Structures are given as structure tokens and as C-alpha cells.
Amino acid sequence: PPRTLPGGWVYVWGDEFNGSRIDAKKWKPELGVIRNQGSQQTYTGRPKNMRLEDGCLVLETHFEKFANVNYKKSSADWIKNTKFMPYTSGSVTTIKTKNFMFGRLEVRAKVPKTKGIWPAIWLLGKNKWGWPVNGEIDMLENISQQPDVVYSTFHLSPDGVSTRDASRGGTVKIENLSDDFHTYVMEWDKDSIKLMVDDKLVKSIDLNTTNYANGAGNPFRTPFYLILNSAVGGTWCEKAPKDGQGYPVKFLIDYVRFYQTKEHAQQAKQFDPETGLP
Ligand SMILES: [Ca+2]
């Protein structure tokens, strides 16, 4: 786990996942049905779905009918009224363990390949806004139909006012992307965000264009928490088969490394994290 990188970067936080077990002061399981009224999976902290094998985090998706721990808890009717899901999988979140604000975030991962799988590396902004105004940085999203295509994608409202999703995203095709591990990299100042695979640029954003109207002030100059997950289905994503053909399937994260220059820790201290204003 290098401490340096040329550019006077320096390791600040991460996980090579070499432990006896997932480190609870670094990751927490998401539990139950969380998102996407078209999804087919419920999320569990059970090693079945979540564990360290061969020095990766393993998020492992099983065709398996399983009760939704949110079956009558949470304020979304379709979650609140869905007793069971076919399909269990894993999701870890730093929501409660680590927030990131400026730096370079390196995530190395091999992705599953079967009908309906939706592996994702992504971050949500913690600030006075709710989705999508808070912000969302999708380093990776992949879907079954188009399995060699990497989507990286920013989500945010057009001004501070409208809560419509004025998203900006790019794509690269990597041929047989499921064969090898690829490094997903986000560089982030208070002036831009770069989202790469494998040193190929998927999407840049200039943050001098994501200012929100009046005061409000920029969702991308607040801290963001990290999510590693495999969903199943989606309103757009091939749905996984009624009978679970192709499953089980694994999403392997070799490592998560966060780095910061003197510069990136400097810029952080100089913005109201609740708003992104100077
Ligand atoms: Ca590792």
C-alpha cells in the first residue's frame, strides 16, 4: 500500500482487505431494500453476501428469497409494502466511518458478468441537501446489456432550487471488462472532478459550473461518503432471471486508497461543509 505517489500525494485512508474480517470501523453493511423501485435484491451483512476472500472484499449476489428488514419500516411505500425480495447481495457504506473532501480515491475491482447484475462504486454528498441536490459521484456503474461499458456520472440539481437530476456522465468501452481487475480513480479539487478507469478519462466536471443559485453554494465542495454494492435489476437494467440462472455471482474489490496533497487538505478547511461556500 504505497504511502506517496509522484505529485506529493500521501495515503490518508483505505483498505487492502487482508484482515481476518471486514473492518467495522471502516465499512458498515447496508441492510434491507434501500433504493430503486425496479431492483430485485435485499441487502445483508451475512458473510454469504459480504466477506474477505483472497484479499478482496467479496460482495456476493445470490438468487435467494429473503425477508426485507425494512418490510414495514421506512417512508417509501414500495419498500414498506415489499415483504420478501428474490436475490440477496451486499452493500458497504462509509456514511458513518469516513467522509472524503478533496483528494484522489483509487478503487481496484473485478466486476461480475450475468443478466441483471449492477455493480457500482459511488459517493453521496453529506450536507443540508437531500437527493439529488446533495450530489452523487458514480465512479463505476455497469449494466448486463452493455457489460463492456463503464458509466461515470455526476448527479446534482440544475440550480439550488429544482430537485430534478441535471446529471452529466461519460462512458468508456473496455473489451471483456469482466476478465481483469481495473482501477477506478477520482481526482477532486475545489476546481474540478476527474473520473477515470485505468488512467482513461470517463467524465470531468468543472466545479465553477456546479454553483447553485443565490447563496446556496456548490454540492461538490462538501464531504462525500463511499458505497460499494451490487444491485440486481432496476427500472433500467435487464432484470435477473425469475429462476436465478447465472447466480451466484461475485464483485471483488482488491483495494480502496484515499490520498491528499498538502493542497487538497488545505482547500477542505476553507469551505462550510454544510453548503460548499467559501
Ligand atoms: Ca487487496
Residue numbers in the entry: 10 to 287
Quote the passages of the study that discuss this structure, keeping the authors' original sentences.
Overall these data reveal that the nine GH16 enzymes analysed are endo acting β1,4-galactosidases that display a preference for polyLacNAc structures found in mucins and other similar glycans such as KS.
The apo structures of BACCAC_02680, BACCAC_02680E143Q, BACCAC_03717 and Amuc_0724 were obtained to 2.0, 2.1, 2.1 and 2.7 Å, respectively. These finding suggest that the side activity seen in Amuc_0724 for some substrates with glucose in the −1 subsite is likely a relic of its evolutionary origin. The human mucin samples were incubated with Amuc_0724, due to its broad activity, in combination with the sialidase BT0455GH33 and the products were labelled with procainamide, and analysed using LC-FLD-ESI-MS.
